[PDB]
Paper text:
The proximal half-fiber is formed by a parallel homo-trimer of gp34. The protein is a highly intertwined trimer containing a 2 nm-wide triple β-helix domain interspersed with three wider domains in which each of the monomers forms an anti-parallel β-sheet. The long tail fibers recognize the outer membrane protein C (OmpC) or the lipopolysaccharide (LPS) of E. coli and are responsible for the initial and reversible attachment of the virion. The carboxy-terminal parts of gp34 that we crystallized occupy the part of the proximal tail fiber closest to gp35 (the “knee”).
Author numbering:
A (entry chain B), C (entry chain A): 893 to 1289
B (entry chain C): 893 to 1288
The structure:
């Protein structure tokens, strides 16, 4: 009648067909319902998951817990919240991959049009090459060098540290001063010890070096002077020829030298032996200069130029009866020579009557003497007697 | 004939069927055409998108703009340009994910066989662990420490900066000199102010410290000497026992001490009062020594060693008629003592006849004198007369 | 009869049907077998790949090597090894994308529940924003500034380097000392040259500056003193008023000045041209002062305070007959004046009899003299003759 199906015209089948043989189609299959295949599936070029009100997804089933199967099912879901009316409408288009516990990753176009790729864990690339910015909130470690075309800036008080062997060296800006500091040995990442090698006042720029300073190749203080607690050893260059050496631009200035070798000090002036004499009349001692004796001594130079330069020589005693005598000379640029050392006159080295043209206090001899008022010999006074053009001899008493 | 579908052998059906009940299959479905399901679809194990000349893709539709739908449709496409597509041939195999506007990301293998994973925006992981290298073209910020097993190199003139509080401190290599510099207060990322704490010349390595230098625990200049503009205060260690103090390795050298306290300066030589007298005969004045007067003074030492060491003591006046006198002594290592201070003779402090063994210029007494030529008394010469065995007198 | 298909009840079919027109479904399609579509395919909302023991995948075919086709096929596979009984069972759930040669990338959740996203090559984002840690094993390069809230630490002996123009400057902790060093010109990334600008001893903190030091705005040594090899030029500030200038807190201390200009040196003491006289009886010479002659000289100051301050003036000869004479003075704080310069007495500049109140040895005149024992004139001794209350004459031969 029409309870059987036609091969030639359109037809509506109201019984469930089971097809036990291969079904072939050469025209569109259009269903308003589901498809289920117990074997594999293939289609040409494009698979489209259609959306009529809910986000689209692919589900990868986990299957039995055996072989190469995963522990959880996963999905790809394409969704957003721009149209959902929540407190957040900024997740405009999201491609999210995850399992039953949480997403693994997603890409997202924000409502602002920018794209994010979120990874819910650790990203493990080989190389990284980012065209834009980097931020990293946690600790960072690099296995090799780090080069920047810009500046390195630290907001940590301990800012820059170099660790090698037993010690950390570091630069610390504590807001008041910037310090160059060192760790205890074996505490290389830790705090500063008690050493204060160098600091810089952040306000004034003034530097304090706290554990001693050695300088090679000269020092010049341009301004402000120098204060020293509590001695200066200005050590002159000691040469065999100090007695005759012309100064140079390198040897001008202040220094002292200990001339302690006889080959040198024998060329220099000595001390003088002194004999303590007694004035017969008054009993007061006076020193009579005796023989010169060569001695070690200190040579001290002063003055800063090849014109302005002088020296002092101060003998020091090394034998039990040795005395000390000082001597002076001045550099004579126009003569290209040192003046001859002259003796300083002092209470240990007094000028002698013959040095100055003074009559000795006793046992004296002279060419001539003029007496205006009287000469007394023993108890006789000799006085002028001009009225008789002679002298009177007055026995006293 | 029969135009009815045989239930028993192979049948080509040439009208459109419309199946209202569940359709079961137990053998392959094989179509040369499209499929469209208005409900969900499932398959076992594997889904293959066949490629007969155009790249394969999955399209995820956006649907109506409501609920949890995305604003744009997305696609996964597997494509390349090694065999076509304009000028680039190096993108061999690309797995691209994106929306109607642009890709979000892709992986590719290039023609040389290397893999890139491109993200068209911000990658936001928790941790990063890269086995190879890193390049970042833009500014970088780190929330905690940054440790490198290698060196940190900056190609920026301002190279390394430590900011804390009001100030940035920084090292600047300007190509000529390397400077340690400071910002103005509250300009911590900015340029250097006028301070010049320290620079190093890049050619000579000579250092200039520009805002003063304090040093503790000693200074030694190994070579090249020292030049100072424009004074040196070498301040000796003032102790109560300076008069008797033996030098030590610490106190040898040059210094000066102001001995201003009588407890100490009373131990040292004073100045001498002096009275100007006039020689009656010549009219020429001379200074006659009187009482010693204790006085503050400057003690200055010279010499660098326990052998080579001497001192000067220069009194300074603190009362209106006070004079000034210098005194000297030498350290005597072998006797373990300072020599006694001796007075310096100078124009303000001349020797006296008593110091030198000389007769005073008048009112004098002596034991004996010998006169070779003549003794004149008033206007009479007393001379010897051999032809008489005595003296003779001669007027004028 | 039942050689045709019934159109109104359930019908098992055992022929192979070939449908040449569009097939329309309005109820589920349920197959135990495969599906293959030579055109495109679409479903609504969800696609599920079922798993009955082997991991699920999608395969994207490369097709012919033409147009916009890829060089290799790709797949997405969701798989694991937790259940496989192998030596690694930690890869619990893996979402893996790759081609015929290898994976490109994968996400996984491990057995510990943590997520990794592995990229088998170079990750190329625009920006990076990591909420956790960063480790990079290879070389790192940064195009702009690098700012850390924490400390920068290097474990490299050469730790921090600033390159500009021809030179690298760097800080090197070699485990013994920390050095500030410089490259040769044009070797900006290389080793140190021979320069030693600054180093810090890691154990003591002592600093050595090796290529000279200039300091401006003053130096103070708080402790430990100063040693200088091998001279000190303490250069006083030379003003026109040095003769009368009161000291100030800036000018106290030790210095020397070369007073080489007559406008200034004519205000200071001169030297004396000396005149040699000869004792008539001994033939021994003695010097006395001739004319004073103004001269350039060295002015040297000593002392540290406005109380404790003195000066020396040492003339230097600039002509044949010129001689060096020294002069001294003391700052008198309570009088607010320098003492008058007084002449130093020395061998070149001895005191005269008239300076000391001594009788001249030659050609002397005095008011009175008392002789106790004898006066001899030529060959006659005049002696006290107390027995005859006079004086006795005694010719001596």
């Amino acid at each position: 009648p029409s309870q059987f199906i036609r091969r030639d015209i359109a037809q509506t089948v109201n019984g469930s067909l089971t097809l036990t043989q291969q079904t072939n189609l050469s025209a569109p299959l259009v269903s308003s319902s589901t498809g289920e295949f117990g074997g594999s599936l293939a289609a040409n070029r494009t698979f489209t998951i259609r959306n009529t009100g809910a986000p689209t997804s692919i589900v990868f089933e986990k299957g039995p817990a055996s072989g190469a199967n995963p522990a959880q099912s996963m999905s790809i879901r394409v969704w957003g919240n721009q149209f959902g009316g929540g407190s957040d409408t900024t997740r405009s288009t999201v491609f999210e991959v995850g399992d039953d516990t949480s997403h693994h990753f997603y890409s997202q176009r924000n409502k602002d049009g920018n794209i994010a790729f979120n990874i819910n864990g650790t990203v493990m690339p080989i190389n990284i090459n980012a065209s834009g910015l980097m931020n990293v909130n946690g600790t960072a470690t690099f296995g090799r060098s780090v080069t920047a075309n810009g500046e390195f800036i630290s907001k940590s008080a301990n800012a820059f540290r170099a660790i090698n062997g037993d010690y950390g060296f570091f630069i610390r800006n504590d807001a008041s001063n910037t310090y160059f500091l060192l760790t205890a040995a074996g505490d290389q990442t830790g705090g500063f010890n008690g050493l204060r090698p160098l600091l810089i006042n952040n306000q004034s720029g003034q530097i304090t070096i706290g554990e001693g300073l050695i300088i090679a190749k000269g020092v010049t203080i341009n301004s402000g002077g120098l204060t020293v607690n509590s001695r200066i050893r200005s050590q002159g260059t000691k040469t065999s020829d100090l007695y005759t050496r012309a100064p140079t631009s390198d040897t001008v200035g202040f220094w002292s030298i200990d001339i302690n070798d006889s080959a040198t000090y024998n060329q220099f002036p000595g001390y003088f032996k002194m004999v303590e004499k007694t004035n017969e009349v008054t009993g007061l001692p006076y020193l009579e200069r005796g023989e010169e004796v060569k001695s070690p001594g200190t040579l001290t130079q002063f003055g800063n130029t090849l014109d302005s330069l002088y020296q002092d020589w101060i003998t020091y005693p090394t034998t039990p009866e040795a005395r000390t005598t000082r001597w002076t000379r001045t550099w004579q640029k126009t003569k290209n020579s040192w003046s001859s050392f002259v003796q300083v006159f002092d209470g240990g080295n007094p000028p002698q009557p013959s040095d100055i043209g003074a009559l000795p206090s006793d046992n004296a001899t002279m060419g001539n003497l003029t007496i205006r008022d009287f000469l007394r010999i023993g108890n006789v006074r000799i006085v002028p007697d001009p009225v008789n053009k002679t002298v009177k001899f007055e026995w006293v008493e």
